[PDB]
Amino acid sequence: VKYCAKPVNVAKAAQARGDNLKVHFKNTYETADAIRGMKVARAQEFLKNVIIKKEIVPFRKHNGGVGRKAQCKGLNCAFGRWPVKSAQFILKLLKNAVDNAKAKGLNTALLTVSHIAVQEARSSRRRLYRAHGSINSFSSSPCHIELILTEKEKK
RNA sequence: AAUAAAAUAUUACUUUGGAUAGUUUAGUUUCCUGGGCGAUGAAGAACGCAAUGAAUUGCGAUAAGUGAUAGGAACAAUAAAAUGUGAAUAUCCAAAAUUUGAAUGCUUGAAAGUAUACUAAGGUAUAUAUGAUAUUCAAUAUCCA
């Protein structure tokens, strides 16, 4: 699976990617939307607070039946949740990209999460035995995640 | 009156999907030659056999192969051994061909078995109907001493 975009300067960027990750797309799509654009150090702090339910992930698009929370004030979204599994998966990719940046020799304190995209992946099927002799589909929703860190500079 | 979070629209890239294009060791039809099975056990079924095999292919206790005749230097995923004193490969040939199956000594269900005779174990023959010949008989059935 290729990357959605290429960095402007390959010498000052780092990349990490995960394919067919066993994590819900709709949860990880909203989590990756929250950390887009902030600094790597800030993003790691934000993702860690989400795990222990101290900062919200606003479910802006997929908000059907999602309950309201007190931390969703100011985000123009009345709904949010604390996806632990999806936050953990991104935390492992953010760490992996950072080690790639360090090998390149970049300055970790200057890196930001410039590009982060989530794509749908192939589903896996399972049986759900319903009434009157029926069987349904019990399908997973995996996803691919791509992460690109670039240094922030004045323009 | 204001927001663009959601929503909507266009393009580029990526993704799920497998359309489209290119292609064919596969099919369909017609035509030519034959139309060559079996008690000398067929077609079919079952089991087994490779140095590493489950299927498939080939084969039958001589097992992915034996002899003979052609054939001329390979096979390979990995080792071995053999090999111009003959490796692969080919066959209307020779030997060999497990349990069954018309199945045919008797039985057979998913049944393991078992009788007699001939030459302990092994191997042969013994089902039903039927033609010819040989031999042994039955019936005063017709004569007949």
CA quadruple A70, A74, A80, A83: dihedral sign: negative
For the CA of A62 and the C1' of B9, the distance in angstroms is 21
Please report the sign of the dihedral spanned by the C-alpha atoms of residue A14, residue A18, residue A24, residue A29. positive
In angstroms, what CA-CA distances link A36 with A9, A79, A93, A128, A138? 19, 19, 14, 37, 31
Residue A123: nearest nucleotide (C-alpha to C1'): B16
Pairing of strands A127-130, A134-137: antiparallel
Residues 6+ apart with CB under 8 A from A42: none
Is residue A37 within 8 A of residue A114, CB to CB? The reply is yes
Query: Nearest nucleotide, C1' to the C-alpha of A122?
Result: B16
User: Is the distance from CB of A104 to CB of A117 less than 8 angstroms?
Assistant: no
Structure tokens at A14: 């780092």
Closest nucleotide relative to residue A143's CA, C1' based: B15
Cα distances (Å, whole numbers) of residue A58 to A80, A100, A115, A133: 4, 30, 19, 40
Cβ pair A77, A60 in contact under 8 A:
yes
3-state secondary structure of A25: helix
- Which nucleotides of strand B lie under 7 Å from a protein CB? 3, 5-7, 13-17
Q: How far apart are CA A79 and CA A65, in angstroms?
A: 9
